[PDB]
Amino acid sequence: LRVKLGGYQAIHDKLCKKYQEVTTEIEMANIEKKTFERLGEHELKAINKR
Protein backbone atom coordinates (compact mmCIF):
# COMPACT_ATOMS: atom_id res chain seq x y z
CA LEU A 1 0.00 0.00 0.00
CA ARG A 2 2.78 2.47 0.87
CA VAL A 3 4.22 2.31 -2.64
CA LYS A 4 0.83 1.93 -4.35
CA LEU A 5 -0.53 5.07 -2.63
CA GLY A 6 2.66 7.11 -2.14
CA GLY A 7 2.21 8.96 -5.42
CA TYR A 8 -1.35 9.99 -4.58
CA GLN A 9 -0.19 11.08 -1.12
CA ALA A 10 2.69 13.13 -2.54
CA ILE A 11 0.21 14.92 -4.81
CA HIS A 12 -2.03 15.72 -1.84
CA ASP A 13 0.94 17.03 0.15
CA LYS A 14 1.83 19.36 -2.73
CA LEU A 15 -1.77 20.59 -3.02
CA CYS A 16 -1.98 21.33 0.72
CA LYS A 17 1.14 23.50 0.61
CA LYS A 18 -0.11 25.33 -2.48
CA TYR A 19 -3.55 25.84 -0.95
CA GLN A 20 -2.11 27.26 2.27
CA GLU A 21 0.07 29.71 0.31
CA VAL A 22 -2.88 30.89 -1.79
CA THR A 23 -5.27 31.32 1.13
CA THR A 24 -2.75 33.30 3.16
CA GLU A 25 -2.17 35.49 0.10
CA ILE A 26 -5.94 36.03 -0.13
CA GLU A 27 -5.96 37.01 3.55
CA MET A 28 -3.17 39.59 3.21
CA ALA A 29 -4.58 40.90 -0.07
CA ASN A 30 -8.04 41.30 1.47
CA ILE A 31 -6.45 43.23 4.33
CA GLU A 32 -4.70 45.47 1.79
CA LYS A 33 -7.99 46.00 -0.08
CA LYS A 34 -9.79 47.18 3.05
CA THR A 35 -7.07 49.59 4.20
CA PHE A 36 -6.57 51.17 0.77
CA GLU A 37 -10.33 51.51 0.39
CA ARG A 38 -10.43 53.29 3.75
CA LEU A 39 -7.24 55.19 2.92
CA GLY A 40 -8.75 56.26 -0.40
CA GLU A 41 -11.51 58.02 1.52
CA HIS A 42 -8.97 59.76 3.76
CA GLU A 43 -7.01 60.97 0.73
CA LEU A 44 -10.20 62.35 -0.84
CA LYS A 45 -10.72 64.52 2.25
CA ALA A 46 -7.08 65.60 1.98
CA ILE A 47 -7.62 66.73 -1.62
CA ASN A 48 -10.37 69.13 -0.58
CA LYS A 49 -8.19 70.38 2.28
CA ARG A 50 -5.11 71.12 0.16
Binding site: H12, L15, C16, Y19, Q20, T23, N30
Partner: peptide, 13 residues
Protein backbone atom coordinates in the same frame (compact mmCIF):
# COMPACT_ATOMS: atom_id res chain seq x y z
CA UNK B 1 -18.13 32.61 3.09
CA UNK B 2 -14.88 34.25 4.15
CA UNK B 3 -16.21 36.76 6.64
CA UNK B 4 -14.19 38.08 9.55
CA UNK B 5 -13.29 35.34 12.01
CA UNK B 6 -14.16 32.60 9.49
CA UNK B 7 -11.70 29.83 10.27
CA UNK B 8 -9.33 28.55 7.57
CA UNK B 9 -10.61 25.39 5.95
CA UNK B 10 -8.69 22.38 7.21
CA UNK B 11 -7.32 20.43 4.24
CA UNK B 12 -4.76 18.21 6.00
CA UNK B 13 -7.19 15.24 5.88
Amino acid sequence: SGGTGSAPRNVSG
